[PDB]
Design a protein around this motif. Structure first.
Motif, PDB file in Angstrom:
ATOM      1  N   UNK A  38       0.748  -1.034   0.079  1.00 18.30           N
ATOM      2  CA  UNK A  38       0.006   0.059  -0.004  1.00 18.30           C
ATOM      3  C   UNK A  38       0.843   1.360  -0.024  1.00 18.30           C
ATOM      4  N   UNK A  90       5.563  16.324 -23.282  1.00 17.82           N
ATOM      5  CA  UNK A  90       5.405  15.217 -22.092  1.00 17.82           C
ATOM      6  C   UNK A  90       3.763  15.224 -21.922  1.00 17.82           C
ATOM      7  N   UNK A  91       3.109  16.436 -22.117  1.00 17.24           N
ATOM      8  CA  UNK A  91       1.463  16.181 -22.099  1.00 17.24           C
ATOM      9  C   UNK A  91       1.110  14.956 -22.589  1.00 17.24           C
ATOM     10  N   UNK A 120       9.266  18.242 -17.520  1.00 13.52           N
ATOM     11  CA  UNK A 120      10.603  18.194 -16.635  1.00 13.52           C
ATOM     12  C   UNK A 120      10.180  17.855 -15.302  1.00 13.52           C
ATOM     13  N   UNK A 122       8.443  17.790 -12.132  1.00 13.18           N
ATOM     14  CA  UNK A 122       7.344  17.104 -11.847  1.00 13.18           C
ATOM     15  C   UNK A 122       6.325  16.700 -12.985  1.00 13.18           C
ATOM     16  N   UNK A 123       6.637  15.795 -13.670  1.00 13.40           N
ATOM     17  CA  UNK A 123       5.823  15.224 -14.708  1.00 13.40           C
ATOM     18  C   UNK A 123       5.334  13.880 -14.445  1.00 13.40           C
ATOM     19  N   UNK A 124       3.936  13.574 -14.118  1.00 12.58           N
ATOM     20  CA  UNK A 124       3.427  12.361 -13.501  1.00 12.58           C
ATOM     21  C   UNK A 124       4.044  12.222 -12.116  1.00 12.58           C
ATOM     22  N   UNK A 125       4.746  13.093 -11.992  1.00  9.85           N
ATOM     23  CA  UNK A 125       5.529  12.779 -10.352  1.00  9.85           C
ATOM     24  C   UNK A 125       4.490  13.286  -9.354  1.00  9.85           C
ATOM     25  N   UNK A 126       3.738  14.271  -9.729  1.00  7.43           N
ATOM     26  CA  UNK A 126       2.310  14.614  -8.677  1.00  7.43           C
ATOM     27  C   UNK A 126       1.522  13.086  -8.851  1.00  7.43           C
ATOM     28  N   UNK A 165      26.372  -7.929 -10.662  1.00  2.00           N
ATOM     29  CA  UNK A 165      26.653  -8.643 -11.832  1.00  2.00           C
ATOM     30  C   UNK A 165      26.476 -10.196 -11.466  1.00  2.00           C
TER      31      UNK A 165
END
Lengths: 166, 90, 166, 166, 90, 166, 90, 166, 166, 90, 90, 90
Positions: A38, A90-91, A120, A122-126, A165
């Motif tokens: 979770x 990025x959109x 750049x 925060x992209x999806x990062x939120x 390795x």
């Protein structure tokens, strides 16, 4: 939709499109069990590039189509990132996220550059930080020192793992 | 592990030889595996072997590619020469 | 397409448009053999500017059209960079890369300024870092200290070589 | 088109619009012979401002309309820069370059500030670096230390020359 | 060189006098040429002479322009005064 | 046209709209005689702001409508700048310049900020540098150190003058 | 090396003379090669020789180009004069 | 609009989407009472990351949907930031601010990196500094030393609070 | 127009929207009398933040609507800055200035950060430096050391004043 | 010069008094002219006088503007007070 | 506090077990709470417990997830092993 | 000054009590005025008093806001407690 950049190797594994892995099983067992959380379903990897890690990924996907994946995830499916670019960029990459979040049935593996970028940040990062959307990253720490860490909430989002390795 | 590498190299054994039209000799294969691991810090035997390999696979092909008949890759020179080409004191 | 900035001297060498080189043969032998590498096909050069290096490049291209190039590369062909600029700029330069990656048949030589720029940074450098697209750079270390090095993965992408004044 | 900022004094010299120069002849002989170069047609000047240098330029243009210009360049014609500005600015200045490159028939003299700018950097400088478009710069070294030099490929593009007070 | 300047000034000799409606006296012309070179660091005798000149050409015209008959430019004052106007101790 | 920003006080002086000046006569004599120059008709002023300088300007304009202006300029007329702004802005300010250059009959006084701007740089400054269009600037050196100077060809365009508090 | 340069200059020997319609004399060619290397820091004998050369090739042509019969480039002056034109004390 | 990055957990709390907190009540009582201030409605938090703080946030939101929130704020609603990015980036983030300011009905919690950025600095920070738009930040002082402080007017905008590990 | 960021508290004071001040009367007498100056109508304040200074401002505005303001200014009216932001930003803030300069009837108080900014520097500061547009600033010297001072002509534009804690 | 200033102030003498509805007393006018020049570095007596003046013209008007009959501007206080308001030790 | 954590862990007790299909034994729960606080500097028992927990919850599930019947999470190993997997010397 | 503050506080005396529905007791008002000035460096008695005040006005309201009848604000605790809540050793 869920195409172009959206792609999966699981069927490809059921298609036998790829290579049976070895030895990262219990390694994957971790990577697997990351999804259980979770807190963080979302692992990231450290290690040496080009060593089989994205196949180690596929290793999951095999063990997925193998149903060596246990319950919750068995419905879910790999997504192998596609990286490329095309006005804005990025959109799109932003866009796909609800789609797969709409998918109710999958998982994506983010691959290597998890990026501190010019265009750049925060992209999806939120939407990452949304506490949803099981996904996987990987790198070597040299990068890992930054994005997941410099937030630390993405550290709170990401679970780091590394393997030597073989 | 060095050994698994050999296997994973054995995995790509057919690969780049079918790219480079050569015959990989596992002797070499295990050789650099030790040797690179010994001599190469940076890239990783999962690759750097194959690096050497393909590069060796090149160097042979190079010779084999153009004017220097063996299609197979030797153990030694393939490792050695190239590895010596990598460093020295073969 | 594959024109304007995209240009090649190989045919020009088969056209005899340029000068037979000397002496950098085994030097080129290296530069040549750089392409062999699954790791880094992509060399960069250090040395003194204006000394014949881009002809040393052409030296390859001769040895290419000479077929002194051994196998794998024999199909591939030089590309000599064109530098210039024109709204955005680099996206073009960004654009051409898939084209030549689409070309399945060539190689480009990046020339001198491999640049830390204002408008920049990673341009192709990821698609460079994509682990594809055999290419060659050159400079003198004074620059080399930075871009290839400050990443070090472009160092992991680039192979440095230098040759003294003949 | 090829107007506004695009202007020429050659006809003006054939129009006699300007002053017959003296003494920079062999000086110009150099500046002239700079164009001969497949490497760098493009000279830049150092020296003391306001001394006749842009007339020294015109000196070429005279010697051009004089046809003291030898062969290749005889068709080509001066362009005397116009500096001014007006949304964006430079794109115009960027734009004209293909036009004159389209002209197949001219040359421009870039004048003094060859600029490290805020809004800038590489402007034509790639299309400069395109290895095309015969042009001339000038300054005193105090500037010369930077733009042509800090690249050094524009140094590889530019040929510096200076002349003392007559 | 100071002298070539005079020539190049002689080049523009007709120029600004035909602008300033005056008669340049080369005496002045060579004068400032030395003198400016002596006394003026910044601009350049290729100009600064003419600077002085045209300015002298003004100062005369100024006087000649309005209430102070000589249309020619003197050697001295044209240099001197102006140059003294530039600095002092004529 | 030649209105809005284009305005003149000369008629206004003949209209007596303004103040008879004193004492800057020979000062103006210079400023006057600046126009005489084939080299630089165009003076700029240094000194203390608000002291009468733009009236010192008007002083010319009086001496103009006084016809204390000698010959060549007697036809020409003051223009007092208007500063304001309104899509683009400067192109207007750019535009008016040919108009007044078309006027064959006037002069403008540029007033104080002769500007290094964000949106700028060379605006008329080439058409300034066109070696045409008699105009006047003014400032205190603190600004003068830059625009006219940092070019130095605008220094070659501008003639600096200053006068102490009366 | 200075010498290889000569060869590479010999490489372009035909080049710019067939541009400049002159006859290169290797005496000159080796000459500047030393001499430039001696006297010129900045550009490189791989070029700067040819620089001098072509420039010499110009200076001759210049003389030869217009009013000063030798089409060949001398050793000395071609180096020397030009090089003296470069610096002094021939 | 007020979506994508704009999101709220309050309804989610009324939806019971999240966890009943404990013990930070009077802690929140502060955080709560921060909004009371005509001076600074806007708190920021210090402490140890990942400890429940954004749930401590939610703790408010619970106590909000609990209406343990007293009067003024009871209408207002949480907003939980979303961080991500996509030409420009921040203008969006800039844009949403009037929207929520237009909302007359909410509050946002800014989360952790309150950033000194390359592309940045004052973003909303003026509209922050506008003395409007009740919002909340948090970090550990290590960051807090800078942005809120290096202005100090954002210090004058922000109220710092910290709580030890429970 | 003259709205949004443009706002006034004078009517609000006539509306009684705010607090009758005390004791800064003769203090204001200065601040008042600053406007008298053909040189600098425009004061700035130093002191301790949050102490009533912008009410001290309002103190003027009261004394304005009180008509404790003497003649010239009695027609003029407070403007209380609004700070916020929204493509470009400042041009708005730039724009309003002519509007209020067009107003022939008001005054603005610039508040605290009179800013050395990234995106900035001279904004109105020339139109400030235009020697028009009566306005007021304030800060504590810690800032005052820079913008007004580092120009010193804005020092020549601004009149500093400070008052101790009452 | 201080004196010309007075004249140029006399120039604006009617100006701001017709703005400020007062009567300028040249005594004051010359006064600050010296005095400002004495006491004020920054702005310039061409203005700073008038600065003081208009400000004095204000201060009077201020008093005259509202509750403190003289419409004229005194020499002294107009200079003095204001100037003392400028500095001190009247 | 360590204890409140347990409660807040008890808060998420149902949470990730209903994610991980296991039965949390508060014995473990308090255990790591001490133990992590003892042994783990970086993350925080408000989490790092649950970290261990979920990770333990994984490790069990891992074993329980695939081939190693207890659905519950032990006190010890869940803490211990994992914690030993964290460090050592169980 | 501390005292003027009280007045300016008396200025806002009605203000936040009409916000906080309480009765300010100037005893308190002067109290913190001294006391804050004594004990609080950072914010300013022009505020920090009111800070304390409103905060006290809260703390009372807090108690008065919810379960702890006095609507007025005490001198002491309002200062004291809060101020002790600020620091200690009431």
């Amino acid at each position: 939709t869920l195409d172009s950049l959206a792609r999966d190797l699981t069927v490809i594994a059921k298609d036998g499109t790829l290579d049976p892995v070895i030895g990262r099983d219990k390694e994957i067992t971790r990577v697997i069990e990351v999804l259980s959380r979770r807190t963080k379903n979302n692992p990231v990897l450290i290690g040496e590039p080009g060593v089989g890690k994205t196949a180690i990924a596929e290793g999951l996907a095999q063990a997925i189509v193998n149903n060596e994946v246990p319950e919750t995830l068995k419905d879910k499916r790999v997504m192998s990132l596609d990286m490329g670019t095309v006005g804005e960029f990025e959109e799109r990459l932003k866009k796909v996220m609800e789609e797969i979040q709409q998918a109710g049935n999958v998982i994506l593996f983010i691959d290597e550059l998890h990026t501190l970028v010019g265009a750049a940040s925060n992209i999806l990062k939120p939407a990452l930080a949304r506490g949803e959307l099981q996904c996987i990253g990987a790198t070597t720490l040299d990068e890992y020192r930054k994005n997941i860490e410099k937030d630390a909430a993405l550290e709170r989002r990401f679970q780091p793992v590394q393997v030597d390795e073989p | 592990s060095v050994v698994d590498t050999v296997a994973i190299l054995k995995g790509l054994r057919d690969r780049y030889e079918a790219h480079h039209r050569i015959n990989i000799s596992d002797e070499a294969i295990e050789a650099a595996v030790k040797l690179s691991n010994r001599y190469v810090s940076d890239r990783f035997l999962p690759d750097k072997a194959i690096d050497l390999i393909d590069e060796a696979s090149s160097k042979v092909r190079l010779k084999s590619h153009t004017t220097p008949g063996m299609s197979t890759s030797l153990s030694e020179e393939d490792i050695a020469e190239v590895i010596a080409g990598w460093t020295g004191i073969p």
